[PDB]
Design a protein around this ligand. Structure first.
Ligand SMILES: Cc1cc(O)c2c(c1)C(=O)c1cc(O)cc(O)c1C2=O
Ligand SMILES: Cc1cc(O)c2c(c1)C(=O)c1cc(O)cc(O)c1C2=O
Ligand SMILES: [Cl-]
Ligand SMILES: [Cl-]
Ligand SMILES: [Cl-]
Ligand SMILES: [Cl-]
Ligand SMILES: [Cl-]
Ligand SMILES: [Cl-]
Lengths: 152, 150, 148, 151, 150, 152
């Protein structure tokens, strides 16, 4: 298992597609332990047409979504390594989300960095927690539990 | 007590494709709100969530509850006032106790049921559930703060 | 009932022109009752019209045509995703359509279509679109199913 | 007064993206007729779903384009070219009849609308005509629309 | 063939919405020149931001369209209308030169691309020409590309 | 006149809007001399749906467009400073483009940095040239001339 993955690799693992694939690159990854990835934030995103007119703010719920997708990548690869064929038959689902706190608004030009740690894992059930950071500062925190389920 | 999309557009700053509340059916000031958003396949999000399997994002369900809550907090204090609305902004500080029980898909009428757990000054804590045909599909608690637009 | 997943297996229409979310009633060579949810979160409303969201009358008719198409596909070959994937649908004629009430975000647009006549791939249906029990529009139409 | 471009169209019709289906007006006779057109390109969002690997301009949108052409005719015949008055107007479809599609419209076609006023009284205009591509009739249609103040 | 429609273009070029900027090919002389076009309509997403109340087809997209035309020419010159082989090739555009915009392009215009092979040495193709609206030259440019395995 | 401008400032000067506003932040600016700005590249951009399927590559022509907008921002603030009032009475027109080279493909996760200097300028006619960089490497080179004109 490598520690750096690019969008081409992410596309082979996550089922999310435009406009809900919110992870552009993975900078570090340790199986069963953690992942660090990020998503570039640019004004050229449809979401900003409505959030908000003349005041582009990246939706906090999307930051959370981005952290979850990062965790899902971590969970899957921790169990099957980089296996596109098996990834195509699995799907990660949100079970719970807790202790979410938004500290600083994310805006175009920002590099939204995800830092997720594995708090507990048993089979298909994974509990991760961490933060979203921009230039070293914590812009958000969250905890969530997800399940790796059958796509069919 | 009932507000249609045109009323909603005058209170909330959210616009396409992030305005996730279509109509308000019930509203008791300082108390509660019941509103909903129709889910249809003809929504852009379904192009990627997911291909060949349309499922309304759980985080967007939470977003819809937040918008309902902010509408509740705002109108409780100032009523239906478009003018004042433009001078205030309701952003969310925290979200907790979120649980997803059932997937939401095209054809569903996603109903938001939020109540005021507590409030002090401009800090408002709301909580409740998201329902589809009488069943709880999600639950969450959120804390918002009302401030002056920049 | 037939849900979006099933509708997708029969109708060739896709985003942003798939305007039927669920099929509630189906009677081969007789009639069909289906619907589409209308929400503000649809791109069409950016232009129809700004600050005044009104689902386009022509799209209501389109939705009725699609509902009629599903009835045609299934009356002809039953629920067969394999045959469906080779066909598409063409509008042939539209007539006697009248709009009575504007459809807007938050409405459940219900299609009610019955077959007036059919032969081969050519199907003629007519009926109404309803919101909460009221007729918001009436229309008759004829469409042709064909090989891609 | 007889030829208008997209700038002029945007100042009269209330429709906007992705529902403004008239690009240019080539000839206009007050209270009588109008000829306009819309270019059809693959680079339009409707083609993502109508259909996949077979782009066909929706018949219902051709009608919409004809109605919009009639709407422009109706408005200017009423108040002349007055953007300030047009700003707060809307256009509702009332009826559609005798429409027949003969030839599919595809990317690369110049969809030309030819509308003639069949009857009009106040805000209610009843127009009828055809949609053409390269001089051939691809569609026929009759429709009645009402111009209304945004209230 | 000499005339190709959108369904033919889709099988040769990898570009898809919103970056397929060639609607039809009207003329094609293997290794010599190509004449094709793209209709410009207000119903295109790019006009939402370029520019509000002043729809002007981006000059850079006119060049992109000219580049796509050159690519189709190069490819068809090498293998003809072969959808299967098309899936295994890519045309990287290396440079762009001598571009000049003389007249703005707007909704309602039929943007016609006129390109001819300037030089072909190995995997390198050099094309140049103009874009025209109703007989008038609206833009001109030179471009060089390299053919390679996808 | 300051040297750093964020998206809300760019919105008040450039007339470009979604999906054609392709500068996110200004990091350095010297009036009538040069400018350094950048646009974050993310998978969550509509353009990637067609360029290309299963292989996101930011269009070379859009990179040039981005450099042009940066130039236009420098040009305008050079003649009128940060003036939103006069900014809304103008648009920019591409006149020519020359010496364009595409050396490295740009992909999601990249921070596309624009480096432009003024080659010549008189009245509303500005001629700039420079590079587009990612992690300090030259991804593209270009020269272009633009004109600021009255919206009329
Ligand atoms: C520290 C912080 C966190 C946030 O999530 C927001 C803001 C600030 C914020 O100021 C803000 C303003 C606004 O107009 C809309 C928002 O969604 C917001 C915010 O969401
Ligand atoms: C037959 C064929 C195969 C290709 O891969 C391309 C093209 C044509 C092509 O025309 C083309 C044009 C272009 O501007 C960029 C491209 O990447 C391309 C292509 O990649
Ligand atoms: Cl937010
Ligand atoms: Cl979800
Ligand atoms: Cl209508
Ligand atoms: Cl059709
Ligand atoms: Cl330009
Ligand atoms: Cl490119």
């Amino acid at each position: 298992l490598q520690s750096q993955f690019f969008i081409e690799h992410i596309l082979q693992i996550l089922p999310h597609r435009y406009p809900m694939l919110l992870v552009d690159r993975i900078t570090e990854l340790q199986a069963n332990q953690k992942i660090v990835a990020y998503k570039n934030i640019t004004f050229n995103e449809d979401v900003f047409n409505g959030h908000f007119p003349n005041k582009p703010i990246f939706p906090g719920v999307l930051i959370v979504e981005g952290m979850a997708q990062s965790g899902g990548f971590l969970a899957f690869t921790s169990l099957w390594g980089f296996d596109p064929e098996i990834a195509k038959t699995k799907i990660v689902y949100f079970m719970t989300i807790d202790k979410v706190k938004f500290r600083i608004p994310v805006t175009p030009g920002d590099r939204l960095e995800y830092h997720l740690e594995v708090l507990k894992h048993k089979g298909m059930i994974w509990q991760v927690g961490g933060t979203a950071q921009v230039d070293g500062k914590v812009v958000a925190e969250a905890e969530l539990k997800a399940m790796i389920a059958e796509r069919e």
